From a paper:
Within this broad category of proteins exists a family of long, repetitive, and surface-exposed proteins called Repeats-In-Toxin adhesion proteins, or RTX adhesins. One adhesion domain that appears often within RTX adhesins is the PA14 domain. The PA14 domain found at the distal end of the RTX adhesin from M. hydrocarbonoclasticus is a confirmed sugar-binding domain that uses a coordinated calcium ion to preferentially bind hexose sugars like fucose, glucose, mannose and N-acetylglucosamine.
Purified MhPA14 was crystallized under several conditions–all of them sugar-free–with the best condition producing thick, prismatic crystals that diffracted to ~ 1.2 Å. While many crystals remained devoid of obvious density in which to place a bound sugar, a glucose-bound dataset was eventually collected and solved using molecular replacement with the MpIBP PA14 domain as a template. MhPA14 takes on a beta-sandwich-type fold, comprised primarily of two anti-parallel beta-sheets held together by a hydrophobic core. Two small alpha helices contribute to the hydrophobic core, and a third helix lies across the outer surface of the larger beta-sheet. In contrast, the top loops have similar B factors to the core secondary structure elements, indicating a more ordered region. This is likely a result of the three calcium ions coordinated within these loops. Calcium 2 and 3 appear to have purely structural roles by forming stabilizing contacts between otherwise disordered portions of the protein. Calcium 1 coordination is also likely to have structural ramifications, pinching two of the top loops together through contacts between the expected D-cis-D motif (Asp136 and 137) in one loop, as well as an additional aspartate and two backbone carbonyl groups from another loop (Asp181, Gly183 and Ala185) (inset Calcium 1). However, calcium 1 –and the three loops that surround it –also make up the sugar-binding site, where the structure of MhPA14 reveals a beta-D-glucose molecule to be bound. The sugar is coordinated to calcium 1 through the two vicinal hydroxyl groups attached to the first and second (C1 and C2) carbons in the pyranose ring.
Residue numbers in the entry: 34 to 210
Write the structure that this text describes.
């Protein structure tokens, strides 16, 4: 098992690939029908802010900060961009909660259930997700989708245990195979 989350980056070209990115179902549909343009490992999910489009030349590299060194290639540039992060939560039984600052939207699912989302376009804003209690014996899957419709782009995910303090989400909390 590898520490951190498995990262996938998708270039989306408004026009040829369809309309502006603006909702989770649309983003998920593009992901499901396409192979990622680059992969990476998300060890510390504190990315951006960058301006001039996440899909702009050199921009995903700047956005990913120290995680850029794990990109499999320099993906093609585009108007819009999608990131997916997947792994298993390396957590004992408990009740946890995400807080996310993002531009634009995102959805976090744990064991297939939505636990945080901003289903739309927005300037960078911070939103607290719902408390969730791990259910079943696991592994406890986590799946994050995120997009930039254009302009500025930021994604910072924090995780806490109920009654505790937020920590930047990453290798401390998740692994993948
Ligand atoms: O239009 C609302 C917001 O949309 C975001 O996608 C842009 O990155 C912001 O710069 C803009 O303020
Ligand atoms: Ca590029
Ligand atoms: Ca767009
Ligand atoms: Ca944006
Ligand atoms: Na493409």
């Amino acid at each position: 098992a590898v520490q951190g989350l498995f990262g996938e980056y998708y270039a989306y070209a408004q026009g040829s690939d369809g309309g502006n990115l603006s909702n989770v179902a649309q983003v998920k549909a593009f992901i499901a029908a396409n192979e990622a343009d680059a992969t990476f490992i998300g060890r510390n999910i504190d990315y951006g802010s960058v301006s001039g489009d996440l899909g702009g030349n050199g921009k995903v590299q700047s956005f990913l900060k120290d995680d850029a060194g794990s990109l499999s290639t320099d993906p093609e540039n585009s108007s819009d961009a999608i990131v997916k992060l997947t792994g298993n939560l390396e957590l004992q039984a408990g009740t946890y909660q995400f807080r996310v600052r993002a531009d634009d939207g995102y959805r976090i699912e744990v064991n297939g259930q939505t636990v945080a989302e901003y289903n739309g376009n927005q300037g960078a804003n911070t939103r607290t997700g719902s408390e969730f209690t791990l259910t079943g014996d696991g592994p406890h899957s986590v799946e994050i989708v995120y997009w930039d419709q254009g302009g500025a782009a930021q994604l910072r995910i924090e995780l806490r245990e109920q009654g505790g303090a937020y920590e930047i989400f990453g290798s401390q909390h998740a692994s993948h195979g």
